[PDB]
Design a protein around this ligand. Structure first.
Ligand code: HEM
Ligand code: HEM
Ligand SMILES: Cc1cc(N)nc(-c2cc(CN(C)C)cc(F)c2F)c1
Ligand SMILES: Cc1cc(N)nc(-c2cc(CN(C)C)cc(F)c2F)c1
Ligand SMILES: C[C@H](O)[C@H](O)[C@H]1CNc2nc(N)[nH]c(=O)c2N1
Ligand SMILES: C[C@H](O)[C@H](O)[C@H]1CNc2nc(N)[nH]c(=O)c2N1
Ligand SMILES: [Cl-]
Ligand SMILES: [Cl-]
Ligand SMILES: [Gd+3]
Ligand SMILES: [Gd+3]
Ligand SMILES: [Gd+3]
Ligand SMILES: [Zn+2]
Lengths: 401, 401
């Protein structure tokens, strides 16, 4: 078992949980690919049997009558139907484990506090849309955000997939420009083009909320506009730099990932959007300061009267810190849940300790856990981590187009 | 078998064909990634053969004249003596290649400009001290730093090793207390306790330069007071924060690692101190602000009148940036070579493109290349990287006790 050192404290643990890692990752003893972003009945039975084992351990009924009977129930169903159905309590437990197991999520101290909406009876894209609106309404909760997931019907033989084509429920349009630039969010150029191609009349602002493209099985995707009142947003201002408000920047309250696959016990839910709340660096650092995103860093630094002609002034670092301050101030002013990178990483350390006692380790992707600014100022920088895949899990999946 | 690697800023794709040559297995497996961990008889001929082939290809002389001839003499040397000695030019080429191959080094754009001092005819700590002193004075060069490595005699059985006991040639003392805690540098509490144990008169301050412990084969170590005019230091001041000087902070000009083991063509050099020049985050962020190092971050924030009562004021981030400003300002005013993390990472990207063409890839350790502040503000953050082991190499080794 790998030994894991924390260099700030000097302490040492062994990740015995990694030994149970089911699926395989991208590294070998020849070479590490840790930094890469994107790395049959008997085998369904095998995954199902293991998850069922997990569930019955969690309810302190391991090896019980009910446990054996559920094993045989799942075997009979797979033999007879090629698949099987989760009980509602198993789905709730599966969804929480998927969050708990997500190595790149720094917010996992909260994994047990998750609201699971069971939309496995959903029938169409219209019903899907209503479920999604209710998720957004509940999660947003007028700024006091609540973690949630809505699970749409599972992949099953004979029918197509439910799919949300959008990568998040709230996304700003990215318009390819006259001269070749992008107006709005460049991360969303492709989904923006798909939306117009599917009948959306575009806007031309920098913060135009996209419609949803919702796909029912064996159906073309269907365009749905979100009611403006469900989409809570936060104008960005800076507590001391009054000119900052004249940038006209905004961001939305709810981070709701909608393009990932939820796998539980070998069953695959290709549509299962989940939401929590933002860590301020996602917005302040990545969304606003990535060169390939809104790319405001230089314009802010010029306004700050920094010397932008030499890197050694650290104008980039200074302007990025004030952009992050503005995000935190703006969300607190608006009374919208947000966490800074110091508090989030400090809570993730408590998660790693809880997980050490509970399971013998914690799958964690150092390069995603450490924030994109002030890395070594946070405790996770000095924490060695073991990255591996546990199931239940959220997986990436191809775009449906 | 050739890992695809993407740069997410530009969207460009390369393939790392050089990874196919990786000899020494790393710590990662398909089951788990350990990339974030700091520290994870005639086989000598295959390593020697391989390194000689490397030498002659780099000078367009493969399969010709001196190549075969040199292949035979290394065979003969090992057959007769059980080892071999490097040609001077091979020693030069090997040191440069070990630097070039160092995955954690962001400064490898400089890898072709390296001054190699050949101390292979050394004997006794007194002689080492003279070599180390020539190195320091040459490398320092009145602040116009020049990269340099002094190569002490190789290892052979029956005879003990040459070892420099200090991790670096310049280290500040760490003195324990009537209460456990440390005055000075806590990274060096241990070598400070050894020097004191071996007869050194300790100081009282927080920036006392430690003396050297130099070890000849099979002889106990000898203390050596470094010539005080040979240790160039920089008192730290801030361009606009006048009180920053009064904090009494200093750092030394020359980063000279003196505990790593140079391996070329199967031969091992336990004493081969290499030096270059600092990247400013090394001092301003890690050495001064790590909680287990000088841990000055809150002291500067108090002086800046920052709100240390909430993490969301980003007082840690603001103080951090100013400390880094003060390092860059002080070193520039003292006319001592230094490179900020923006310039350094931009040059590393240049290096990768150079190495893609010259060798089909480059071993890079993402967690070490990305700077410890403002990570995603540098281009290397957005570059996927492949980590693997090539020879010749700088390898870690046990403390000589
Ligand atoms: C409650 C507060 C939450 C916080 C503060 C938080 C924080 C984060 C952050 C900062 C990331 C990195 C995203 C990026 O850099 O693009 C992330 C990734 C992730 N989070 Fe969390 N999250 C929260 C809630 C949730 C919930 C409720 C779930 C699922 C039920 C979840 C599952 C995931 C997954 C699967 C990823 C990986 C996404 C990927 O690989 O691209 N998170 N989280
Ligand atoms: C010329 C300017 C140079 C710069 C700016 C530079 C920069 C750096 C930095 C920032 C690190 C990370 C070390 C740490 O965080 O503790 C590093 C590591 C390293 N450097 Fe360079 N370096 C330079 C020259 C050299 C030279 C001349 C050599 C050898 C001949 C070298 C070999 C290494 C090695 C082996 C490591 C890995 C050490 C470790 O893993 O702790 N560097 N370098
Ligand atoms: C539930 C949740 C909470 C949170 N705070 N972030 C995310 C999250 C965000 C992004 C967008 N990035 C460009 C920032 C990408 C992902 F893959 C995520 F998982 C998800
Ligand atoms: C030649 C060279 C140049 C440079 N800029 N740094 C280093 C360097 C520094 C440290 C100390 N760290 C705690 C910061 C550790 C290492 F292993 C290094 F290699 C070496
Ligand atoms: C190429 C590199 O792996 C990539 O930029 C990663 C690094 N770490 C990250 N970490 C988080 N949290 N989010 C990200 O998008 C990334 N991107
Ligand atoms: C645990 C983690 O791997 C460790 O703190 C590493 C991360 N990256 C680093 N990068 C550099 N350049 N130097 C370091 O000491 C470290 N420490
Ligand atoms: Cl986002
Ligand atoms: Cl150092
Ligand atoms: Gd004002
Ligand atoms: Gd303008
Ligand atoms: Gd006062
Ligand atoms: Zn790895």
């Amino acid at each position: 078992f790998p030994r894991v050192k924390n260099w700030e404290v000097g302490s040492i643990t062994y990740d015995t949980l990694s030994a149970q890692a089911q699926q395989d990752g991208p590294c070998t003893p020849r070479r590490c690919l840790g930094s890469l972003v994107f790395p049959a009945p008997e085998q369904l039975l095998s995954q199902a049997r293991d998850f069922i084992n997990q569930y019955y351990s969690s309810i302190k009924r391991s090896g019980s009558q009910a446990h054996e009977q559920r094993l045989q129930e799942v075997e009979a169903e797979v033999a007879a139907t090629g698949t099987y159905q989760l009980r509602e309590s198993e789905l709730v437990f599966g969804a929480k484990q998927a969050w708990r197991n997500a190595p790149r999520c720094v917010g996992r101290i909260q994994w047990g506090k998750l609201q699971v909406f069971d939309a496995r009876d959903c029938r169409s894209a219209q019903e899907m849309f209503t479920y999604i609106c209710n998720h957004i309404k509940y999660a947003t909760n007028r700024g006091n955000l609540r973690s949630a997931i809505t699970v749409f019907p599972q992949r099953c033989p004979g029918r197509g997939d439910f799919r949300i084509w959008n990568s998040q429920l709230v996304r700003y349009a990215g318009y390819r420009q006259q001269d070749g630039s992008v107006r709005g969010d460049p991360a969303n150029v492709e989904i923006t083009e798909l939306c117009i191609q599917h009948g959306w009349t575009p806007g031309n602002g920098r913060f135009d909320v996209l419609p949803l493209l919702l796909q029912a099985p064996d159906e073309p995707p269907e365009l749905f506009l979100l009611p403006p009142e469900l989409v809570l947003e936060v104008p960005l201002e800076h507590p001391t730099l009054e000119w900052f408000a004249a940038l006209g920047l905004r961001w939305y309250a709810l981070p709701a990932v909608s393009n990932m696959l939820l796998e539980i016990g070998g069953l695959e839910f290709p549509a299962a959007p989940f939401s929590g709340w933002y860590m301020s660096t996602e917005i302040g650092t990545r969304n606003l300061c990535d060169p390939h995103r809104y790319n405001i860093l230089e314009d802010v630094a010029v306004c700050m009267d920094l010397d932008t002609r030499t890197t050694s002034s650290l104008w980039k670092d200074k302007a990025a810190v004030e952009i992050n301050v503005a995000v935190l101030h703006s969300y607190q002013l608006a009374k919208v849940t947000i966490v800074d990178h110091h508090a989030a990483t400090a809570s993730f350390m408590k998660h790693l300790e809880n997980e050490q006692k509970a399971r013998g380790g914690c799958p964690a992707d150092w390069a995603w856990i450490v924030p994109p600014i002030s890395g070594s100022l946070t405790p996770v920088f000095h924490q060695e981590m073991v990255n591996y895949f546990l199931s239940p899990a959220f997986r990436y999946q191809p775009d449906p187009w």
